[PDB]
Amino acid sequence: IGTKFILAEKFTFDPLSNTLIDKEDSEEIIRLGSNESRILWLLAQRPNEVISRNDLHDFVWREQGFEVDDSSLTQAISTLRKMLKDSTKSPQYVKTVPKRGYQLIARVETVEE
Template sequence: MMAKAYLIDGRIIFDPEGSKLSRVVPAGINDIVPLNTPASRCFELLIIRQPEIISQQAMLDFVWGQKGAFVSANTLYQNISLLRKALKALELNNPVKTVSKKGFCLDSSLQISTIDTDTFLPSSHQGKNNNPMVPTYSFIESFIQPRTAIILLSLFSIFLIGYIYFSLQRHNAHQRFFDRYTHFTQSNGCDIFKPIADKATGRYLQYTQSHIINCPDKGSVYLSMPNGKTQVTMVICNKRIGQPEVKCRSFNQLREDENE
C-alpha cells in the first residue's frame, strides 16, 4: 500500500503519521512544523470530513478513542488552539472554524487532495530531498465477536461504502484543485499550464522562453509563480492531471527578477 499524505492548497503537506506540517519544499527549519499527536489527529479528522461540522464528542472519540469519555473539553480546545498556531506559522490563517454550540469544521475553500509520496516527491533546484515524508494511516484496532453472519456482513458493507465514499471525495478534491489551471503555451513538447486567477501571462511566457523545461513525451507542466515572490513551483506529470495512471513530481526554483 502506497504511503499517503495530504496536499493543502498546492503548497503545504500534512503528514498524519509523522504528525507534522511542512511546505512542499522546505527552505529551512521554520518550514517544518511538528504537531503533537492529539492536534494531528484533530486535523486528520477535519480533513477527512471537510466541510462537515464535527461535534465535540465525535472529535474526542476519534482522537482519544475509548479514553475520550475522560478527556475534558478544555483539553480538546487547547489542542485545536495548537493546531491553529501551527497552520498560521505556514501562512494558513484560521482554516479551522469553531461553530458555536455545534463543534468544529474546516474551511470549505481550502483545497485538499491526497497524494502518493512514492510518486509525488518534492524536490528543489538544488537536488532531490533525501528524506521525503512517508506518512501512513493510523487505525484504532478493535476485535469483535459477532453473534451472527448478518452482523459481519453489515459491518463489512458499512466499511466498504465508507471507503469508496472517502476515496471518491479525495480524488475529486485533487481534480478540483488543478481545474483552476489553464493551458497557455507549449515548450519542448510539453503542455504548460498556469493558474487561471493569475492574469500575468506575460511573466509566465517570459519564464518558459528563458528556461529549459523538460517533461515526459506529451507530458504536462503546471506552473505557479506567486506575485511578489521569487519562488517558482512546477508540478511535472507524464500526462494531464485527471487522466488514468498520471504520475507527477514537484520542483521548486528561484527566478532572478520579478519583471511582469
C-alpha cells in the first residue's frame, strides 16, 4: 500500500512516491523509474525470493496498467545498485542469481504506512 521502508539501514525508500532519500544526505534524493519500482514491488510481494524477468513480465501483464519501458530488468538493477551505492565488483545489497533473476539483500525495515 506504498508502505515506507528503510533499505540497508542507509536509505529511506518511499514506494508510494517512488523516491529514495539517503539517510546520510537528506539533500540526495533520487527518483525511481517505472520498471525499477516494479522490481522492488515484486520483492515486497515476495520477500527473500528471486524475481525473474518473467516475474516482471507477469506484473506488467497483470492489472490494467501498462509498461512505460523506462529500462530493462538488468538496467533497472544497475540503477538500483547505483541508488543504493552498492559495490560494483561484489555487491552486498543486491544479489544476482544466474538464470534465475535478481534478489534484494538490503535489510528492509518498516517505517510507516
